[PDB]
């Protein structure tokens, strides 16, 4: 599975993304600390996950799934965040059209403040289509999404959840 | 989702794996056809799934699931076979694979060589990968026989 590191975790390892083996969230995280032990102190509190850390599987907080026991497929992606704080995060989504993201933002009560700019409670979401990816004769649009604000983490993951649909 | 191409599909596209969008098996196959149109008739029969092709989701034949309606997560991996196969598994211990092979009625013919009803499984450790301070074992698994596809996929299921 792929592991995306944010904020503190990124600064502490020099890495933004890693590919690590594991059939459950726990297995992947145990391998993460075997690879970068500097993260052990912040990721685990005793045997379980540290209470202030947030781990998301395809946009879903794993705590509301099966936590460390959550099964995952080999190609799954996890997002790891240290204690919540105001910030800015970005991600490029494949085949996630602007109009569709807009519909989600509108359905969440977001207010349009410009073309590709929406304000949500505690965050501002900015998005623009970048260079499409080419797979054979198929052009796959790519959408760059940036989220910043006190609740940037929350909305950033809500968007990842939406895109997974 | 990721799509692994085997035999015919691999040689034609010249690709072993592709990253394609889609929330269901059907959608991914649709985009696959878009990427390589020459596969339309070899995968679809109008709006339905072809009958000679085989599609597996994390080692499970989708025909026994929900067919084209089978839901898919972004991290899903599909293996597609047209009418020998191999994969290198990361951190898939030999003793574990062996326990599965035996549970499936397999017979140990030698070191890293087991025989199954319809196939022969060959496996060996290759150069490990390295991520940070962690060494990740790499097990290369090769499957041949009349039922190689089926067994290769059950091993993929077991590894996951
Ligand atoms: Cl947990
Ligand atoms: Cl069996």
Q: Which domains does chain A have, with CATH numbers?
A: 1-85 (3.10.20.30), 86-165 (3.30.1370.80)
Q: Which helix (H) or strand (E) holds B116?
A: strand B113-116
d(CA B83, CA B79): 13
Q: How many CB atoms lie within 10 A of CB A17?
A: 11
Overall resolution, Å: 1.6
Q: What angle do CA A84, A161, A129 make, to 5 degrees?
A: 100
Angle between helices A98-107 and A152-163 (to 10 degrees): 120
> B-chain residues within 8 Å CB-CB of A65?
none
Angle made by CA atoms B102, B106, B107, in degrees to the nearest 5 = 105
B35 shares contact with chain A (CB less than 8 Å): yes
* Method used experimentally: X-ray
**Cβ contacts of A163 on chain B, cutoff 8 Å:** 74
Is A19's Cβ below 8 Å from some Cβ in B?
yes
- Residue A138, chain B, CB below 8 Å: the answer is yes
Q: Do B31 and A163 touch (CB under 8 A)?
A: no
User: Are the Cβ atoms of B35 and A137 closer than 8 angstroms?
Assistant: yes
Partners of A159 on chain B (C-beta within 8 Å) are: none
Consecutive H or E run containing A30:
helix A25-35
Number of H helices, E strands in chain B: 5, 12
Residue B15 makes CB contacts below 8 A (sequence gap 6+) with: A136, B5
Residue A34: strand, helix, or coil:
helix
Q: Is B19 on the interface with A (CB under 8 A)?
A: yes
Distance CA A127, CA A102 (A): 10
Q: Tell me how far apart the alpha carbons of residues A6 and A12 are, in angstroms, rounded to a whole number.
A: 10
Tally the residues of chain A: 165
Under 8 Å between Cβ of A25 and A55: yes
| β-sheet bridge partners, residue A45 | A48
Please give the angle made by the CA atoms of A103, A108 and A113, to the nearest 5 degrees: 70
Residues 6+ apart with CB under 8 A from B154: B59, B104
* Chain B residue with minimum CA distance to A28: B91
Q: Least CA distance to A58: which residue of chain B?
A: B74
Whether B131 and chain A come into contact, CB under 8 Å, resolves to: yes
Contact B1 A138 (CB under 8 A): no
Listed in order, strand segments (DSSP E) in chain A are 2-5, 17-19, 44-45, 48-49, 54-57, 60-61, 77-81, 87-94, 111-114, 117-120, 123-135, 138-149
Which contacts (CB < 8 Å, 24+ apart) does range A40-43 have?
Answer: A42/A8, A42/A9, A42/A12, A42/A82, A43/A9, A43/A80
Q: Cβ B76–A75 below 8 Å, yes or no? A: yes
Give A-chain residues touching B73 at CB under 8 angstroms. 58, 73, 76, 164
């Amino acid at each position: 599975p792929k592991v995306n590191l944010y904020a503190t975790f990124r600064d502490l390892t020099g890495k933004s993304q890693l590919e690590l083996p594991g059939a459950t969230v726990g297995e992947v995280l145990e391998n993460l600390v075997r690879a970068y032990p500097a993260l052990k102190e912040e990721l685990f509190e005793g045997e379980g996950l540290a209470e202030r850390v947030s781990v998301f599987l395809e946009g879903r907080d794993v705590r509301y799934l099966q936590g460390l026991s959550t099964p995952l497929s080999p190609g799954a992606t996890l997002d790891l965040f240290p204690p919540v704080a105001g910030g800015g995060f970005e991600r490029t989504f494949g085949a996630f059209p602007p109009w569709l993201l807009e519909r989600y933002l509108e359905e969440w009560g977001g207010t349009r403040e410009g073309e590709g700019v929406y304000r949500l409670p505690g965050a501002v979401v900015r998005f623009r289509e970048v260079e499409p990816l080419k797979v054979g004769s198929l052009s796959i649009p790519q959408l760059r999404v940036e989220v910043e604000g006190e609740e940037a983490e929350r909305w950033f993951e809500r968007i990842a959840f939406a895109a997974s649909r």
